[PDB]
Amino acid sequence: AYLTHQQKVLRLYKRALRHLESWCIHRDKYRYFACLLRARFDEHKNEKDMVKATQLLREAEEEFWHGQHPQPYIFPESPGGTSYERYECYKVPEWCLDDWHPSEKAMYPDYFAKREQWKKLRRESWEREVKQLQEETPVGGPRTEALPPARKQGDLPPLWWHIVTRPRERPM
Amino acid sequence: FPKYEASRLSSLPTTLDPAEYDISSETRKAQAERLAIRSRLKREYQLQYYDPSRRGVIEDPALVRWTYARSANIYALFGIGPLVFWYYVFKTDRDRKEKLIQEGKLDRTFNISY
Amino acid sequence: MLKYIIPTIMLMPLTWLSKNNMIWVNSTAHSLLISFTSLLLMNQFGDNSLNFSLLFFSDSLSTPLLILTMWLLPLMLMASQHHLSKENLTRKKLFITMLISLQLFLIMTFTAMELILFYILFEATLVPTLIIITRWGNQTERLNAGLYFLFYTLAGSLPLLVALIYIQNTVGSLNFLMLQYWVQPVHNSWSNVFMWLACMMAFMVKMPLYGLHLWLPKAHVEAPIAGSMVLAAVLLKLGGYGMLRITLILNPMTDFMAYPFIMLSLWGMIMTSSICLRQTDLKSLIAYSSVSHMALVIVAILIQTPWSYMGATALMIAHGLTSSMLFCLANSNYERIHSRTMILARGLQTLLPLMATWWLLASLTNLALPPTINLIGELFVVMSTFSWSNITIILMGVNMVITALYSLYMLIMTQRGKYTYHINNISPSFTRENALMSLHILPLLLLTLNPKIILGPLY
Amino acid sequence: ITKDMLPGPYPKTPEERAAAAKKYNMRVEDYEPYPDDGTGYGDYPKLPDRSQQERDPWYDWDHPDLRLNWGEPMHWDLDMYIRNRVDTSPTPVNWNLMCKHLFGFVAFMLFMFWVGETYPAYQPVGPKQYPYNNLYLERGGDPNKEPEPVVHYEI
Amino acid sequence: SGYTPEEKLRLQQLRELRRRWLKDQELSPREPVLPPNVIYKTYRHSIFAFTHVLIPVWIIHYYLKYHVTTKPYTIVEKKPRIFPGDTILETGEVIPPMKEFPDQHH
Amino acid sequence: MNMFSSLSLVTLLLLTMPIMMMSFNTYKPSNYPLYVKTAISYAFITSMIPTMMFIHSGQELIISNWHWLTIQTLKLSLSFKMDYFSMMFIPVALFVTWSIMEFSMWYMYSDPNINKFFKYLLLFLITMLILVTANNLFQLFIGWEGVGIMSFLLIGWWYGRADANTAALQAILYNRIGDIGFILAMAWFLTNLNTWDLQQIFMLNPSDSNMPLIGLALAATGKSAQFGLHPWLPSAMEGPTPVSALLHSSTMVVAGIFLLIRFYPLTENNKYIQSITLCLGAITTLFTAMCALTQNDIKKIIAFSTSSQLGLMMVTIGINQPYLAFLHICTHAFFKAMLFMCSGSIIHSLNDEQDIRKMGGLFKAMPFTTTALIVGSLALTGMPFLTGFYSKDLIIEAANTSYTNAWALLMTLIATSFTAIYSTRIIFFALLGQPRFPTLVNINENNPLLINSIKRLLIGSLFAGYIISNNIPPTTIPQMTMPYYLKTTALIVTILGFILALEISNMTKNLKYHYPSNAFKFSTLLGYFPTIMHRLAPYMNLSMSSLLDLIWLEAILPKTISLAQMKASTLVTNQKGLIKLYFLSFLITILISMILFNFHE
Numbered sequence A: 001a002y003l004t005h006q007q008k009v010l011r012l013y014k015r016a017l018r019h020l021e022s023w024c025i026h027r028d029k030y031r032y033f034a035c036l037l038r039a040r041f042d043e044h045k046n047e048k049d050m051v052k053a054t055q056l057l058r059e060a061e062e063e064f065w066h067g068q069h070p071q072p073y074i075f076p077e078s079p080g081g082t083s084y085e086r087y088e089c090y091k092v093p094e095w096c097l098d099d100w101h102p103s104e105k106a107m108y109p110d111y112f113a114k115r116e117q118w119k120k121l122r123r124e125s126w127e128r129e130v131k132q133l134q135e136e137t138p139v140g141g142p143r144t145e146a147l148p149p150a151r152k153q154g155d156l157p158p159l160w161w162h163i164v165t166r167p168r169e170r171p172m
Numbered sequence B: 001f002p003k004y005e006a007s008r009l010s011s012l013p014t015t016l017d018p019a020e021y022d023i024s025s026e027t028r029k030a031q032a033e034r035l036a037i038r039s040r041l042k043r044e045y046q047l048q049y050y051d052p053s054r055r056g057v058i059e060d061p062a063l064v065r066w067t068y069a070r071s072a073n074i075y076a077l078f079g080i081g082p083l084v085f086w087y088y089v090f091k092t093d094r095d096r097k098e099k100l101i102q103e104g105k106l107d108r109t110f111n112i113s114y
Numbered sequence C: 001m002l003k004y005i006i007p008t009i010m011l012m013p014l015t016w017l018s019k020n021n022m023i024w025v026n027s028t029a030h031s032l033l034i035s036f037t038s039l040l041l042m043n044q045f046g047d048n049s050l051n052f053s054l055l056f057f058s059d060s061l062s063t064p065l066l067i068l069t070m071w072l073l074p075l076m077l078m079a080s081q082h083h084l085s086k087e088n089l090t091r092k093k094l095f096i097t098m099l100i101s102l103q104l105f106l107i108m109t110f111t112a113m114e115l116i117l118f119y120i121l122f123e124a125t126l127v128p129t130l131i132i133i134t135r136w137g138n139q140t141e142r143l144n145a146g147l148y149f150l151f152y153t154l155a156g157s158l159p160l161l162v163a164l165i166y167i168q169n170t171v172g173s174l175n176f177l178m179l180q181y182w183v184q185p186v187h188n189s190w191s192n193v194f195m196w197l198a199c200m201m202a203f204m205v206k207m208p209l210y211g212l213h214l215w216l217p218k219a220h221v222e223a224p225i226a227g228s229m230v231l232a233a234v235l236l237k238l239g240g241y242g243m244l245r246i247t248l249i250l251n252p253m254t255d256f257m258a259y260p261f262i263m264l265s266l267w268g269m270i271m272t273s274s275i276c277l278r279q280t281d282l283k284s285l286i287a288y289s290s291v292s293h294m295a296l297v298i299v300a301i302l303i304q305t306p307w308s309y310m311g312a313t314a315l316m317i318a319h320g321l322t323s324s325m326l327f328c329l330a331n332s333n334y335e336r337i338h339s340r341t342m343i344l345a346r347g348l349q350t351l352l353p354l355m356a357t358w359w360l361l362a363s364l365t366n367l368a369l370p371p372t373i374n375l376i377g378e379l380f381v382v383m384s385t386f387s388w389s390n391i392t393i394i395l396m397g398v399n400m401v402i403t404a405l406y407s408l409y410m411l412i413m414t415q416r417g418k419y420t421y422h423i424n425n426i427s428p429s430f431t432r433e434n435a436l437m438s439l440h441i442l443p444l445l446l447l448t449l450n451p452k453i454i455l456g457p458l459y
Numbered sequence D: 001i002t003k004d005m006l007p008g009p010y011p012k013t014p015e016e017r018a019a020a021a022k023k024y025n026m027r028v029e030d031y032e033p034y035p036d037d038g039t040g041y042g043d044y045p046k047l048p049d050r051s052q053q054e055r056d057p058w059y060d061w062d063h064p065d066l067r068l069n070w071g072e073p074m075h076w077d078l079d080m081y082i083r084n085r086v087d088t089s090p091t092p093v094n095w096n097l098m099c100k101h102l103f104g105f106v107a108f109m110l111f112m113f114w115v116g117e118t119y120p121a122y123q124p125v126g127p128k129q130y131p132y133n134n135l136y137l138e139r140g141g142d143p144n145k146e147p148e149p150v151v152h153y154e155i
Numbered sequence E: 001s002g003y004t005p006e007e008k009l010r011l012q013q014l015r016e017l018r019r020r021w022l023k024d025q026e027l028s029p030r031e032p033v034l035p036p037n038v039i040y041k042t043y044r045h046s047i048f049a050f051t052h053v054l055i056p057v058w059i060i061h062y063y064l065k066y067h068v069t070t071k072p073y074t075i076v077e078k079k080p081r082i083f084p085g086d087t088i089l090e091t092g093e094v095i096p097p098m099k100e101f102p103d104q105h106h
Numbered sequence F: 001m002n003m004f005s006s007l008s009l010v011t012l013l014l015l016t017m018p019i020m021m022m023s024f025n026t027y028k029p030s031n032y033p034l035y036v037k038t039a040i041s042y043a044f045i046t047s048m049i050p051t052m053m054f055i056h057s058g059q060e061l062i063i064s065n066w067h068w069l070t071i072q073t074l075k076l077s078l079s080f081k082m083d084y085f086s087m088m089f090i091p092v093a094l095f096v097t098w099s100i101m102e103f104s105m106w107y108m109y110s111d112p113n114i115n116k117f118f119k120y121l122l123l124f125l126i127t128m129l130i131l132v133t134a135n136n137l138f139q140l141f142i143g144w145e146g147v148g149i150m151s152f153l154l155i156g157w158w159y160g161r162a163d164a165n166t167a168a169l170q171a172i173l174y175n176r177i178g179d180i181g182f183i184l185a186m187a188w189f190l191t192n193l194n195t196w197d198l199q200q201i202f203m204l205n206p207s208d209s210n211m212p213l214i215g216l217a218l219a220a221t222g223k224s225a226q227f228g229l230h231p232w233l234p235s236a237m238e239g240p241t242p243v244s245a246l247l248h249s250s251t252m253v254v255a256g257i258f259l260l261i262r263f264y265p266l267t268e269n270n271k272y273i274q275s276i277t278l279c280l281g282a283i284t285t286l287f288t289a290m291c292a293l294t295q296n297d298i299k300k301i302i303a304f305s306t307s308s309q310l311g312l313m314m315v316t317i318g319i320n321q322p323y324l325a326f327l328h329i330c331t332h333a334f335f336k337a338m339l340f341m342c343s344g345s346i347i348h349s350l351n352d353e354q355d356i357r358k359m360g361g362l363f364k365a366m367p368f369t370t371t372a373l374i375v376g377s378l379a380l381t382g383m384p385f386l387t388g389f390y391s392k393d394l395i396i397e398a399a400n401t402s403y404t405n406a407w408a409l410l411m412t413l414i415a416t417s418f419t420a421i422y423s424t425r426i427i428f429f430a431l432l433g434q435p436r437f438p439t440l441v442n443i444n445e446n447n448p449l450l451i452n453s454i455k456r457l458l459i460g461s462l463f464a465g466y467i468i469s470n471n472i473p474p475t476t477i478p479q480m481t482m483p484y485y486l487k488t489t490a491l492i493v494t495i496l497g498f499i500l501a502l503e504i505s506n507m508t509k510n511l512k513y514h515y516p517s518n519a520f521k522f523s524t525l526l527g528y529f530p531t532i533m534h535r536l537a538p539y540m541n542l543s544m545s546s547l548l549d550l551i552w553l554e555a556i557l558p559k560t561i562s563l564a565q566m567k568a569s570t571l572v573t574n575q576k577g578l579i580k581l582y583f584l585s586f587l588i589t590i591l592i593s594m595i596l597f598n599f600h601e
């Protein structure tokens, strides 16, 4: 796994607490056991033998799998939650506004004037953005998906349009 | 704790997999190599997806290979086997029914739609 | 029939002498008038067919096919004029000429009173169809698709020609009206077994019968939209029409010769429906859908009951309008994304809301929602096939389950979900495209109000 | 795309494996063809039979619904593994134990429905009595025949 | 852990643009620029009753009275139940009562 | 008959004009939802006039107004059966649908496609009335499949959601498997009786009805979500709460029971079918009530309650009590649709939160929702003299004073106890205790549309059972003589369910930490039936597509044919061009011509 040992323990901790919260339900009850669980992690926090620490983690994962709630609580908009992707059918891409009939664009003379400025800004910045990536990407291509910030003033961060202009989470 | 037992339709969890642990310099060098390929392809896609003047489709060679490989092998449950099985079921059924009709032992009192 | 043959030929001078920019306007306008006049063919009587002359006649089986054939010509011109817009002017006129010659052969095929006349016109449809596919197809594989189509058909037709000429020698006539009164029973013998196979295997290939169906997905994937519309809507029906006429003179031998071909159709319909669930090409999915739907028609024709012929007649008309509509719907997407992959362009209901209504209506007719004529035809075949053998209800019932699964899966895959991010050329539906779908779906739904005119001569 | 970028015959040599992997954007170590046996796969990679539901939901995929990236090799049965169809994600219970408990429940229920049929419940009561010879004429009896009378007495 | 200085800086820059983009989704006061108690409620339900009940029932009644019921066995009624002591309107016949009850009671 | 027949049709015609105006587009979308809500409220009133006539003089008639199609000796007409079942269900369906649409005007207020939503709700009701009033099986089939398609389009309302598309197609899959039986029934009736019209089916009264009745039983299993074809109904909780309210009360799910009630003249003479349906209902009512014990999603708990109740209706069919099963359809329609609307009120106020573990403390914060939810739970559990008592209480007495399967009876009583347990579960976790929702409190339930819609269903949940039970004519001999311990069984086990559920609910407040039993997981994971079947059956089917076939293929392949022609071509044409060899072959042709074939003889 790409995750370091330190990252693995933390993800288990958060996962373990959430499933514990599903079992307890009542907040006072959950608080009591959450502190006991934090104690178990705090007990071996300073273990320095990475063969013992790795063993402690693997055993902990096995215990979680035996004790996990079969139906854990999920935030409504998280993957698997009851509202996940509920609004994707209302998210329309912004390029659809180019196909609007003139009479449709005439009802928003001020929105479509601002829209042109952004399109101009996108057109003017693109060439610099492409150049910045070329002269920063090591020979052979990128090694990670991390993108650079803008360096000069008046430069926009490379590859920004589809991040800045993405639909709102409540588009309608 | 009873160990997890994995089926075809119920895969093994990552957290229960011994491979995921015991990091080796080779496995990390394999993981680092896959990420490089993914980042190379992501950059290739992003430089066309974010292009201001591109109106169309970003042809994916991976999707072209997939459909091409799937549509090629044009030519059990696919031979004489199923046909012969069903031939005897209907022939056997219709032979019995014909005999009963001839022997007047099949009730068709109100059967006049066929 | 000359009140339809001559006007159809006049579409050729009209197209060739029309001003350059008016070829599509003039041909479409006047082909619709011919379609309007085709309603006069519905002067049908309870006992006698409509026998115009020694050459041509019309009964309740050929009339709905004749009206479907002439309705389709104006629809193929609408579907064609976009992707041909950059074509050379003369080659536009030749393309339209091939469609006109196909209608001409088709309306004569369905009305020919002499079977050898039927054969010549039946076999003449190959030439315009082959030319359309190989000349105006867009891919390399259009050449192989042409040859498979050509040689699958001739492999069966040449035996058919020998059998028909043999029958005229021993009976004295191949006039269909005469054969109704002079028909004699066919007795068991190896000679009569091969006479039976020759008389039928040409039609089974065009249906197509499962096993001989592999030319059809090839042709569809490679044909232009107009070639796919005629091929699905009408040309497949030539086999069904031929089988409904030729089985008159094959009794009682059809009692036991039908068994292998019923087994292929009963099992074939389940497998082709299942294949539709895993197709990655949209045009190929609709092609395999026709094989599944036409397997019902083969079973119905072979069991030879009054209810099975009414069902088979309705199925052919209903499937003709539905399959043509589905191909046009997939073409409208293809003209945008220029690919036939079903998974490429998703979530289209968001971007093309009205075209998503046409997709819904077309899918519902494909799965045969009551009271559409798609269900009426399908139901009548199920009712009669149940009487033939109760066990068939299981295969019939299963096929309806699978047919629902892939019809809605094709609807869900392309119209629902999230849209594909990088595809940003989905322009709004044109008035041409919307009118094309409404001309498929409205007549299809109107026929529910009066389905007797598509239930054939046994109504 | 050029013909050299389409699938081909089963790879035979290490260089035919090396070139196939590069064509599919895979590490040569991770590339494995389907076993050669005429079925028709060719050099298409054999990818783990894992559902698309099992992939990271929070990663920024090129196709968020399919959870696919642009250019990565698609599983042979991808259309079977989309999030709408076959799911293979781990279950909180073992697959074999689910099958045993589910079948055992059904098998036990059918057994006790049979025991119920053999030993039905009923109330300590005699058969219901109807006048006019068990309602002979009302139940469509032919009137020309005279039925044997059914006689009921007080108690 | 945390953001690296380059990771932090890029988020700052996309943040400025994103918030300016969202601010630009607001509509100006003039937009959209469109082109050229019981007494009221009683009227509103008077029209609905007339158009959606009275006109349809007029059409149905004309349809059923003069086109459907003029054909045989189009509308079939379960015949009325007759009880002892009833009187038939058509023929003025009286149905006899039932015979004297044994007269158990409780 | 003129007023009766005329008014029973305008009810159906009135529901379609809103559809005609949208399609004809001569309407006004300014307030389309109010227009559709108004149409129901008037259609409810016009449907009461025919009902009063039936209550008064028992009037019933059939209307065959349009001759659609004749098929030799099978004539099909648009035929409406306005009888006991039609005259009592239509006002109950329209009254409940009137409340759901008024509730929908508030719940779906911010939905941009609200007009389409109300158009689909209306079409969904129109097909249910076609189904209910159909006099022959073909017209009934129109309604049968009509509700199926409208369920598909409403469950998958949020079509961007992949799970909503999976759930919508799963309703089609299971219901279409049920239609195999429906087609089987139509095939048998046409073949053996020469009719799809109910009057002729009942008049000929087939003795050998095992095949047609199993076809209808299999059809009812899918539509009413009985065991085997049950999972889709809980999955149908993908759709908006108004869909769940209308789906689970006065439309789709009772069509399966309603179909078997239509055919009681046949089933009442077939003991084999009665045993099958009793056992099918008995397992369904137990299994889905056991699943509800450990569900944490409020809609799913109510959804599994409906499956449990539908099993009880199927049990009533089994014990040969068609009219009790019908009365339970009408009474269940009131309080079930109210519970789903009370749940919607909670979900809306807690920002789309559906898990009960994150509710609590709502008893005082949502007073009116709380009142309706207690009345609903008491009505469901069979509290004496509420709407549900007048059907459930009768059914249990009939079941345990009948010649019946002992296991079926026991499983119906245990399931009745479970009904109290999972009703306490919703009340205890949603309303009692301390709040467990997020900090930003937005609890508001003062919309008049929400209050009025629930207020009307609250009144029905109280008196509707009393009103209907006292107005319907008697059609059976109700068994009213039995031991005290059979008379009071339903009350006693329901009370034990409340006590036992209360103790377990209070048991969760203790500072104890426990491992899930196999029993707990089995109930929580719905018996593993969806987990196994929905992975195995799709996988076998989607992956579904000897030496003898090798000959039948390799020999007849176009490659084989086309490649033999290539060999023959090369043999013919690969010559040396030598005069010597060609004339040497002329010599051989002549020799074998005479010596071997005697061409010179």
Ligand SMILES: CCCCCCCCCCCCO[C@@H]1O[C@H](CO)[C@@H](O[C@H]2O[C@H](CO)[C@@H](O)[C@H](O)[C@H]2O)[C@H](O)[C@H]1O
Residues within 6 Å of the ligand: C144, C147, C148, C151, C152, C155, C212, F557, F558, F559, F561, F562
């Ligand atoms: C089953 C009833 C009717 C069967 C009739 C069968 C007769 C043969 C019809 C097709 C004839 C096509 O003739 C020829 O066939 C081969 C494959 O088939 C095609 O060739 C294609 O397949 C071959 C091998 O499969 C490949 O090596 C070749 O690269 C490819 O182009 C030719 O492009 C086509 O010209």
Ligand SMILES: CCCCCCCCCCCCO[C@@H]1O[C@H](CO)[C@@H](O[C@H]2O[C@H](CO)[C@@H](O)[C@H](O)[C@H]2O)[C@H](O)[C@H]1O
Residues within 6 Å of the ligand: C188, C189, C190, C193, C257, C260
């Ligand atoms: C798509 C493939 C379809 C395959 C269909 C297979 C159908 C098989 C049909 C078998 C029937 C053939 O016809 C059958 O054989 C011969 C004709 O030579 C007839 O019998 C005649 O020849 C036989 C020779 O063996 C003599 O014994 C007999 O004296 C003579 O009358 C039979 O009375 C007839 O019934």
Ligand SMILES: CCCCCCCCCCCCO[C@@H]1O[C@H](CO)[C@@H](O[C@H]2O[C@H](CO)[C@@H](O)[C@H](O)[C@H]2O)[C@H](O)[C@H]1O
Residues within 6 Å of the ligand: D097, D100, D101, D104, D105, D108, F414, F518
């Ligand atoms: C009124 C009540 C109505 C509902 C009644 C329902 C009764 C249904 C009983 C079905 C019992 C089937 O489930 C049964 O449980 C035990 C407990 O693990 C299983 O036992 C299984 O688990 C462990 C190991 O995993 C071992 O004990 C055993 O090796 C293994 O088989 C059985 O293999 C299984 O057959």
Ligand SMILES: CCCCCCCCCCCCO[C@@H]1O[C@H](CO)[C@@H](O[C@H]2O[C@H](CO)[C@@H](O)[C@H](O)[C@H]2O)[C@H](O)[C@H]1O
Residues within 6 Å of the ligand: C151, C155, F559, F561, F562, F563, F565, F566
């Ligand atoms: C039932 C009767 C049906 C009658 C149909 C009419 C028969 C027509 C026969 C045409 C055959 C000639 O067509 C020829 O077939 C061979 C099949 O190997 C094809 O051969 C193709 O595949 C082979 C290997 O499979 C390759 O070596 C070759 O490079 C390739 O072209 C030729 O490309 C094609 O030109």
